[PDB]
Each structure stands twice: as C-alpha cells, then as structure tokens.
Amino acid sequence: SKLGGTPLDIDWYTSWYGLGMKPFEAKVQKDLIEPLDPKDIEIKPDGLIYLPEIKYRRILNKAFGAGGWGLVPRSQTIVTSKLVTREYGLICHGQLISVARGEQDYFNEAGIPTATEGCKSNALMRCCKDLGVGSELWDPVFIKKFKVDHCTEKFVEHVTTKRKKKIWLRKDRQVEYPYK
C-alpha cells in the first residue's frame, strides 16, 4: 500500500511443496558451485560488478537440464510510478527452492510490459543466491581484487549534455553510450 503503485497437480502459485525437503544429488552440487570465469563478469559505470542473467540461465540449464526448472509468479505485478515489481519463485525438480522480488526501471508508459520481463530476470538472479550460484559476486574480497586487476577508472566525456564524469569500465572494453 505504501508503494505508489497499482496492480497491472500442484498449485505452484501458492503451494510451498518441497521447500527445503531433500538435497539434490552429487553432480548437481558440483556444477552449482563451479567457479565463475572472470572474462564474463561485467561492471556498471558506477562501480558495481554483476553477471549477465543469460549466464544464470545457462548455468541452471547445465545443472538441472532444460525443463528441469522454472520460474512461477507468486504475486500480482505491482507497478510503481517509476519501477515495476513482482515476486517470483524458483522450482527445480518439482521442488520449490526460494521466492524473491524483482525490479526494473521504466521511463515511458509504453515501457511497462517490456520491463515486466526484466523483473523476472532480476528475480531469477536473486533466487539463485540460495543455490550458491555466483557467490563470488557478493564476496567483498573478490570484488576488491577484480576491480583492481580487471577494471580501470577512466575520466570520460558525456556527449549528450557535454559534462565531464568519472566512471568504471573493464580494461578490454571501450567507452559506450551515452559517453564519448
């Protein structure tokens, strides 16, 4: 109510079946904690690193197989004046794992339903924290080392309104939109 927004076999919408029931078998445990390659970790210009969500999907497919997992909505889509939110639950092997709440930013009215899928991707990313996928992305030591051996802090020109600004970027990457 406080959010300034309005809504847009097993009943997975409300069921809690299997939540923390039994662990998965060995090789799933092995490949769920495969160390992430450094080359495919990206960083915002503000200095925050992350992983592409397609990589989360790829890892999950490698772990459980196609059709072995899925995302289920858990609540009505809430659409605030400046962002779109929804709660999503992750199911694997017919067994609920976790539920999370996703975010996206939209700037035009025609842009809600293109963002309501990005929030699904965000919720998947957030739910995978329970599985241990991509743990190093939240390790402060890992972040500090990665940001010192793979990213540089470059003074660079904002061409839209011509102001100077300092941003973060990867060493092998050039400067993209909206900058020089």
Add this chain to the structure above:
Amino acid sequence: SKLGGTPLDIDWYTSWYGLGMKPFEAKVQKDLIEPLDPKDIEIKPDGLIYLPEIKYRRILNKAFGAGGWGLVPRSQTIVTSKLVTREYGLICHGQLISVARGEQDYFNEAGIPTATEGCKSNALMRCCKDLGVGSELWDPVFIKKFKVDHCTEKFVEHVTTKRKKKIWLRKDRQVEYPYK
C-alpha cells in the same frame, strides 16, 4: 490498471502442471543448445541484434517435433493506445516450461488484430530464453564481436523527409526502406 488499455484433460489456461518437473532426454538437450549460425542473425538500424522468430519455431520443431509443443494464452489481451500485450505460456511434451509477456507496436486502428499475433511471436521468443535457445544473442561479448566483424555503421539518407542519419546494417545487406 496503470496501462492505458482495455481488454479486447488439463486446463492449460490456468494450470501449472509439470512446471520444472523432470528434465528432457539427452538429444533434446543437445539440439536445444546448438550454436546459432552467424549468417541468420539480423540487426535493427539502431544497433540491436536479434534472430527471426521463424528460426525459433524451426529450432523448436527440430527439438520436440511438430505437435510436441505449443503456446497457450494465459491472460486476456490488453490493448494500450500504442501497443498490444498478452501473456503466453510455452508447453512442451505435456509439460509447462515458462510464461512470458509479449509486445507489438500498432499505428492504426485496423492494425490491432494483425499485431496480436506478432505479440504471440514475441512471447515465444521470450519464453525460449528459459530453454537456452539463442543464448548468445544476450551475451555482450558475442554482440560486441558480431557487431565489429559483421555489421557496419553507415551514413545514409532518409528519403521520406530528407534528413541525414546514421544507422547499423549488415555487411552483405544494402539499405532498405524507409532510407535511400
């Protein structure tokens, strides 16, 4: 409600049966992740690459066979003043996989029901992300390399109202409508 629009065996409209129940067999897993050919990846003039949806249909038919999969509506068609949206779920082998929300752009009143199928195609494209089909289209490294070895950035003339503009195009492709 916020969207400025108004609606136009197993009950697949509402059922969640099979969602992430069991993975598919081996060769399906193999051919679901066949690397995409470069020659059939296209790019908007704005610089965004994609794949034709008929290629998604072809891959899905090669994976599951004709009649082995289908798209089911999940919600009433919402028609905003400038776009048409609907939620579609993907079923394969009698087993729900994922649900997504599709988009299309319409510019005339006679054009809603020709776009309400394009949004189906869009939703299929979006749902296939769960299966891992066309993952490289969302890999930033893949995009960067593809855009530097297969697309060029050409200064070209807008003939409708005679203004100059810079757009993206494939190396083997000429310039199409509405330009020179």
Add this chain to the structure above:
Amino acid sequence: SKLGGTPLDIDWYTSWYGLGMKPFEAKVQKDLIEPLDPKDIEIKPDGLIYLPEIKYRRILNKAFGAGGWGLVPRSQTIVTSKLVTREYGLICHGQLISVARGEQDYFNEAGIPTATEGCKSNALMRCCKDLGVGSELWDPVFIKKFKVDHCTEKFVEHVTTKRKKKIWLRKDRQVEYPYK
C-alpha cells in the same frame, strides 16, 4: 500498530512442523560449527564486526546441500517510513528450525523493493544463530581480540561535507566511500 508503517503438503506459511523434533546427523553437526576464518570477517566504520551473508549461504549449502534448506515468509511485509521489516522462517531437511525478523534501511521511495530482499538476508543471518553458525561474532572475547589484532582506528576525512572523523577499518583495507 505502533510501527509507523503499513503492509506492502505442509503449509509452511503457518505450520510449526518439525520445530525441535529430532537433531541432525553427525557430520552436519561437525560442519555447522566449523570455526570461521578471520580474513573474511568485516567491520563497520562504527566498530561493529560481522560476516557477509553470502558466507552464511555458503556454509548452509555446505552443511545441508543445495535444495536442502530454504527461507519461508511468515508475515506480511511491514514498511515503516524509514525501514522495511518482515518475519522469515528457516527450514532444513523438511523441518522448521526458527523464525526471525529482518531489517533494512531505505532512503528513497524507489528503494523499498530492493531492500525487501536485504531484509530476507538479514533474517537468514539472524536465524542461523540458532544453528550455532558464526557464534564467535557474538563472543565479546573474540570481538575484543579481533579488534585489537586485525582492525585499526584511523583518523580520516569526510570528503562529502569536509569534516574530520574517526572510524574503524581492517588493517589490510584502505579507506572507502564516502571518506577520503
């Protein structure tokens, strides 16, 4: 009511099944009480030590396995004007362990639903106290020794509004935002 806020198989939302029913087997007991490494314990600038929550997730995954545990909401999200709260229960091996109440701080309206996951992480951290995970973080002797052999008290400059202040930091760590 006093809080100045408004709400935003086994029914785990309300069930108390398994709470303190039977203990876990031996090796789980061993690895639940593995002594924490000193290098991965961090301290606020105010002088309060803690552990990253991803480390709690990693330890829980090592103890119970992926899918062997989960967090379940226990109450509606309460959103006070300056913080967001919710009650979360920890389930392991199909057996409830404990319920705790989590906190996060939000400073803008767009920031509720990004914090409502941090409060989940906080509740996990708090619930793990029952399991004995990270006990040394609440041992006063451990804190006193750690703060004298691994952290230093440095006079340092606040660059945002240029005032001088004394804060706590680890010996191997430099000074971060918002300071010099």
Add this chain to the structure above:
Amino acid sequence: SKLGGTPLDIDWYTSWYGLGMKPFEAKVQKDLIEPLDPKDIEIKPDGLIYLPEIKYRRILNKAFGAGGWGLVPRSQTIVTSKLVTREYGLICHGQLISVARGEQDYFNEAGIPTATEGCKSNALMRCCKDLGVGSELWDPVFIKKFKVDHCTEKFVEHVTTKRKKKIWLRKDRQVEYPYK
C-alpha cells in the same frame, strides 16, 4: 491492558504437549549441568553479572544438537512506549519445557524490530533456568565470590557530559564506552 503498549503435526503456538512428560537421557543431564567457566562471565557497570546468550545457545547445541531444539512464540509482541516484550516457549526433542517472557530496551522508533529479537534472546536465557543451565549465575555465594576475585570497583570519568561515577568492571577488562 495496564502496560502502555499495543500489539505489533503439533500446533506449537498453543499446545502444551510433552510439558514435563519424561526426563532426558543421561549424557544430556550431564552436559546440561557442566560448571560454567569463570572467564566468560561478564558484569554490567552497575554490578550485576550474567552470561552472553550465545553461550546459552552453544550449550544448548552441545546438549541437544542442532535442530534438536527451538524457540516458539506464544503470544503477540507487546510494544510498550519504552520496551518490547513477548512470550516464548522452549521446545527440545519434540517436547515443551517452559515458557518465559522476554524484554528489550529501545530508544528510537526505528529500533523496535531490532529489539524484538533481543527479547527472543532474553526469553531463551530465562527459559534455560528450568534446565539448570547457568545456575551459578543466580547463586548469591557464587556472585559474592566472583565479584571479589574477578571484578574491581573503579572510579572513572563519563566523557559524554563530564561527570564522575563509580562502576564495576572485570579485572582483565579496560573501560569502555561511554566512559573514559
């Protein structure tokens, strides 16, 4: 009603199952009454000794094992204008032991839900009196001897408002906040 406050298998919220049904087996009885080490008993500056609650949790885990016990709420959280209270029951081996009422002190409005866990810890401490854990903390002879061979009464300076005051502290401990 008199308190100036307002509320914020086996149904353990209301059930009395197992209360005083059968005693536990021998080694549990042994390790529930292990004499407490003197080095880990702390004292307020006012002259009241106690034990850290993490030590109660550690002893309970050593006695019953992780997952062999838990705390269950027994009443709605009552929040008085200056403290937060709740009733908690202790369950071990699927058998209720006792119920107690916990306290915490909060001084700001943002501080209720961080204190509502401290009151859980307090209730655990109080319930453990039934088990005989930490009995010497309530023995007047033990207190008198401990305060004469392990604590000293030091004249010391309150630096916040610069007044002199006499407080209690351990012999091996220095003077902490808010004093000199």
Add this chain to the structure above:
Amino acid sequence: SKLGGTPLDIDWYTSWYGLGMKPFEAKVQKDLIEPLDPKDIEIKPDGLIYLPEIKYRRILNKAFGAGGWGLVPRSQTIVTSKLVTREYGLICHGQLISVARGEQDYFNEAGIPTATEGCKSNALMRCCKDLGVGSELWDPVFIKKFKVDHCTEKFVEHVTTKRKKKIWLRKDRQVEYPYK
C-alpha cells in the same frame, strides 16, 4: 475483582490429570527430603529466612531430571497497581501436583514484565511445599535455632537518607545496599 488490577495431548492449562494419582518411586522420595545445608539459607534484613529459588530448581532437577517437570500457567496475569500476580501449576512426570499463586513487587511501569517472571519463581517456591522440599524453612524450631547460631542483629546506618536502623544479617555476611 477486588484487587485493583487488570489482566495483562493434555490441555495442561485447565486439566487436573494425575492430581494425587500415584506416588513416585523410592529414590525420588529419598532425595525430595534431603536435609537442606545451612550455608545456603539466607535471611532478609527484617528477620525472615528463606532459600534461593535456583536451589529449588536444582533440587527439582536432581529429583526428576531435566525435562521431567515444568511449570504451567493456570490463569491470566493479574497486575495490581503495586504488584503482579499469577497462578501456576507444577507438573512432574506427566502428573499434576499442585497449583499456587505467585507475587512480585514492581515500582516502575517499565518493570512489570521483569517481575512477571519473578512471580513464576515465587509460585514454584510455593508449590514445592507440597513435595516437602525445604520443609525446615517453615519449622519454627529450625528458624529459632538458625537465627541464634547463624545470624546476628546489627545496628547499622542507612546511607540514602542517613537514618539509623536495626536489621538482621548472616554472621559471615557484610552489610549491603542500601545501608553502610
């Protein structure tokens, strides 16, 4: 109604099961009537002797074992303007023994819920009279002899408001707060 106060398997809240059903076995009868040591009996300054309640808990644990007994509330907590009261029943070996009414003195509003546990301890002390625990504390001959060979009547100075008063204290004990 006359009290100037307002309320704050087997349903032990109301059940009378086992009340005086069968006696306990021999060694319980032996250790329930073990003569109390003189050194651990204390006396108020007004001249009334008693035993610490932790000693009652210790004796009960030695008799029945941990988990072999417990206290169950029998009525709503009544809170008079100057004291807090409640009725508590003692259960041992799944068999009700007796019910008593406990007292505590509170002097500030923040002090109700710290006293509502002391009244539990008082009720335990009172209920144990049925078991014969601490019988000598109510024997007038025992009191008279104890007060003449172990306690002295000392003239002593009240330092709070500087008045002289005569109080009772043990021979091996010094003078405590609030006196000299």
Add this chain to the structure above:
Amino acid sequence: SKLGGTPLDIDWYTSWYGLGMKPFEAKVQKDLIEPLDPKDIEIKPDGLIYLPEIKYRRILNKAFGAGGWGLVPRSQTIVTSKLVTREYGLICHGQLISVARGEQDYFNEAGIPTATEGCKSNALMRCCKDLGVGSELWDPVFIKKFKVDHCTEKFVEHVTTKRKKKIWLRKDRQVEYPYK
C-alpha cells in the same frame, strides 16, 4: 451473598469420585494415627494450641508419598473486606476424601494474594481432621494437660503502645514480637 466480599481424566473441580469408596491399606492406617510429639505443638498468646501446617504436609507425605495426594480448589476465591476464603478438596490415591473452607487474615490491599495461599494451608489443616491426623489437638483433656505441663501464663509488656497484658507461651520459649 451475605459475606461482604466479591470473587477475585477426572474433573476434580466438581467430581465426587471415590468419596468414601474404599479404605486404605494397613500401614497407611498405622502412620496416619501416629501420636504427635509434644515438642512441636505451639500455642497462640491467647491460649489456643495448634500444629504447624508444614507438619501436616510432612505427615501426609510420610503416609501417602510425594505425588500421592494433593489439594484441589472447589470454589472461586471469596475476598471479604477483612479476610480471604476458599473451598479446597483433599485427594489421596486418586480418591477424594473431604472438602473444607479455609481462612486468612489480611490487613493491607497488597496482601490478598499472599494470604490466598495461607487459606490453602488452613483448608489442608481442616481437611486432615477427617483422616485423624492431629486428633489430640482437639481433645480437651490433652489440651488441659499440655497447657499445664508445657505452657506458662506470663505477665508481659506490650512495647508498641506500652500497655500491660497477660499472654500464653511455651516454657522453653521466650517472648516475641510485638511484646518485650
């Protein structure tokens, strides 16, 4: 209604089960009528002899064993302006014996719930008359002889308001409060 006061397996609150059903076995009959020692019979200063109630409890425990008997309330506590009353039933070996009404004197408002237990003790004393415990206390010949060979009638000074009065006391006892 006439009293100037207001209320404050087997349902023992109302059941009459076992009342006079079968007599107890031989040794119980023997030790229920053990002659009382003279040294532990006390007398009021007004000239009325009695026995301490803890001795009744001790005799009952010796007869039936701990847990072999109990007191059950039979009516709501009636609180007159100057005394507190309640009806209590005595159960032994799962067999009701008798019901009696107890008394206590209270002189302050804070003193009701400390007296509502004394009335329990009084009711126990009164109920034991059915068992024949302490019969000699109501034998006029016994009283006359005891008062002539064990008690003396001493002229003694009331120190509170300095008036002279004649009272009864035991030969081996000195003069207590409130007198000289």
